[PDB]
């Protein structure tokens, strides 16, 4: 019953007797599978996680300069060099500077000058790789097993709960039989590669917000980068795209940093597919998982139960789902449980032919003593109609209209 209230639902109607039902699972969407003498099953794809992603590249968007200097030589007096030129963590520019008798050099001509400064990337971003071997889906299913109340949409426990199971699926071994001991087993042979796509993309993380980028876009970025995953003060390649030299005079080429580049990339990411991490792994949002579950060993619980006799009570006001169906919570007061709930819909009301079909097929009461509560979902016919809960005297009728 984990799908009551879903915006993007799919009323997938199965085949009477047949074990073949084709279901497509979109993220944020669920599928209610109703069939012949078998319980109706809610099916939802909750998570599309990825496995270890290796850090392929890492660019820089906020640098910090330090320890700069400028050595200058006189014209025709040698090539100017510094004490820390060959250090890789230092960016340097060797240009010419006009000299003369005013600066100190005894010749009138252009001279040498070299300016160096230590590079240290403050804020950097990382780009990772994704493989089809890495992704791992996660499907949760919950049967309309005549569950009490509405707050039966909580994953607390569940391990000790039937009619509701979790299955994990991998492209390598996507078999993943779903066990629900009260109602039997439920096979599900699912096929990946419907998720479009994973051909050649990257998982880009900058500060804490992640996206999925292309190959040559992420390759073509004018920012410092290094291809290693080392945290040991590694050498940054292409340090010139963030460090600028302007207007040297005689002994100091004014160095200027090009500032931060976070929002600069954010303007270049308007339209890219977003992403979300999961602590260590990463989540996806495309989904569209085509699947085909076989319901052979599914068994309907509650057929031997004999139609309840005492009176029900409306526990909460029935409401109309956005699709048209109506949810009802009723409350039985009697030790005659377990027993099948006598709920139906009729327009004549006397007596007593049914019009609409149920959604929670063959609704029961789990507990026996003493005053239990249970949930219901019906598909009323179009137009005005009555809903009837209970049998004989003390039964409850209610007016209803659809669309």
């Amino acid at each position, epitope marked *: 019953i984990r799908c009551i209230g879903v915006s993007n639902r799919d009323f997938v109607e199965g085949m009477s007797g047949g074990t073949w039902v084709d279901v497509v699972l979109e993220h944020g969407g669920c599928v209610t599978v109703m069939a012949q003498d078998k319980p109706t099953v809610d099916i939802e794809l909750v998570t599309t996680t990825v496995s270890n992603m290796a850090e392929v590249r890492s660019y820089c968007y906020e640098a*910090s*300069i*330090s*320890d*700069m*200097a400028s*050595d*200058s030589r006189c014209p025709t007096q040698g090539e100017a060099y*510094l*004490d*820390k030129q060959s250090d890789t*963590q230092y960016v340097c520019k060797r240009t010419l500077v006009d000299r003369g008798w005013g*600066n*100190g050099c005894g010749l009138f001509g252009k001279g040498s000058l070299v300016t160096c400064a*230590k590079f*240290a990337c*403050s804020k950097k971003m990382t780009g990772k790789s994704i493989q089809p071997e890495n992704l791992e889906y996660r499907i949760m299913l919950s049967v309309h097993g005549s569950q009490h109340s509405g707050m039966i949409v909580n994953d607390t426990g569940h391990e000790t709960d039937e009619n509701r199971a979790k299955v994990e699926i991998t492209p390598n071994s996507p078999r993943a039989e779903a066990t629900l001991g009260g109602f039997g087993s439920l096979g599900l042979d699912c096929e990946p590669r419907t998720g479009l796509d994973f051909s050649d993309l990257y998982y880009l993380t900058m500060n804490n917000k992640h996206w999925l980028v292309h190959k040559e876009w992420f390759h073509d970025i004018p920012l410092p980068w290094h291809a290693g995953a080392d945290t040991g*003060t590694p050498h940054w390649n292409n340090k010139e795209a963030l460090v600028e030299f302007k207007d040297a005079h005689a*002994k*100091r080429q004014t*160095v200027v940093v090009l500032g931060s580049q976070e929002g600069a990339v954010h303007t270049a990411l308007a339209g890219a597919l977003e992403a979300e991490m999961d602590g260590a792994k990463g989540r996806l949002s495309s989904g569209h998982l085509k699947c085909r579950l076989k319901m052979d060993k599914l068994r309907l619980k509650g057929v031997s139960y004999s139609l309840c006799t005492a009176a029900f009570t409306f526990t909460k006001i029935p409401a109309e789902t956005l699709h048209g169906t109506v949810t009802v919570e009723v409350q039985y007061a009697g030790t005659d449980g377990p027993c099948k709930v006598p709920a139906q819909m009729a327009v004549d009301m006397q007596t007593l032919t049914p019009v609409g079909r149920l959604i929670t097929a063959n609704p029961v009461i789990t507990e026996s003593t003493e005053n239990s509560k249970m949930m219901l979902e019906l598909d009323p016919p179009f137009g005005d109609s009555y809903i009837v809960i209970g049998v004989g005297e003390k039964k409850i009728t209610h007016h209803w209209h659809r669309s």
Partner: antibody, heavy 119, light 109 residues
């Protein structure tokens, strides 16, 4: 906004080990260099050494290289200046200074720590 | 060894121009930084890059480095400027520090 809180006054004896500290708060500690300056009583300023906390890169003056040890724990944003064998001639006021963008460009000064060493 | 040479004492009458000289060899190729230190207080930056004045410093403190000599100019000296004055620079390599001997100023008002 920048705050370079130095250690408290220290009185030691000749031979004892000592480590003075310069705790920083208010700027990017792993970006700017950290320099130390010694000033003996009645004497002038003497630059001892500098250190980059990004990789603990150290530059020592030839008059002090081999007699002091400069370290820094960038995790807590604090510089250090320690002596293994304290001489009697080491009694002075010590300043920690956050450098600027240029090499050895002194930008922010501390309040100075008083080091007294007598037998 | 390498030291910067400063005149030990310099005197100036109130309202006149006090001049302080810092002698160096690599100063034609490196910059200088003028600091002022009062008794008990820590040093303050007076001049950086040999010609620029920071904020919070009065407009009278000027400076200029010419060839092998740096010069600190104090136009309109006052009795509150009586303190110690140091220069500072880098060695020929530019990665080590160099402090001058000092110039204790004296105002006779």
């Amino acid at each position: 906004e920048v705050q370079l809180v130095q250690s408290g006054a220290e009185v030691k004896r000749p031979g004892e080990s000592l480590k003075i500290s310069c705790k920083t708060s208010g700027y990017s500690f792993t970006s700017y260099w950290i320099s130390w300056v010694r000033q003996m009583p009645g004497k002038g300023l003497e630059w001892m050494g500098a250190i980059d906390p990004s990789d603990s890169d150290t530059r020592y003056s030839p008059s002090f290289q081999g007699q002091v040890t400069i370290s820094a724990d960038k995790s807590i944003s604090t510089a250090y200046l320690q002596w293994s064998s304290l001489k009697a001639s080491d009694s002075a006021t010590y300043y920690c200074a956050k450098e600027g963008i240029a090499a050895r460009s002194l930008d922010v000064w501390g309040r100075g720590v008083l080091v007294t060493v007598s037998s | 060894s390498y030291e910067l040479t400063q005149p030990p004492s310099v005197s100036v009458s109130p309202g006149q121009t006090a001049r302080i000289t810092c002698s160096g060899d690599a100063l034609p190729k490196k910059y200088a930084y003028w600091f002022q230190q009062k008794p008990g207080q820590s040093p303050v930056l007076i001049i950086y890059e040999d010609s620029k004045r920071p904020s919070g410093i009065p407009e009278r403190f000027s400076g200029s480095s010419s060839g092998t000599v740096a010069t600190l100019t104090i136009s309109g000296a006052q009795v509150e400027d009586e303190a110690d004055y140091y220069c500072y620079s880098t060695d020929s390599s530019g990665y080590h520090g160099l402090f001058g001997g000092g110039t204790r100023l004296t105002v006779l008002g």
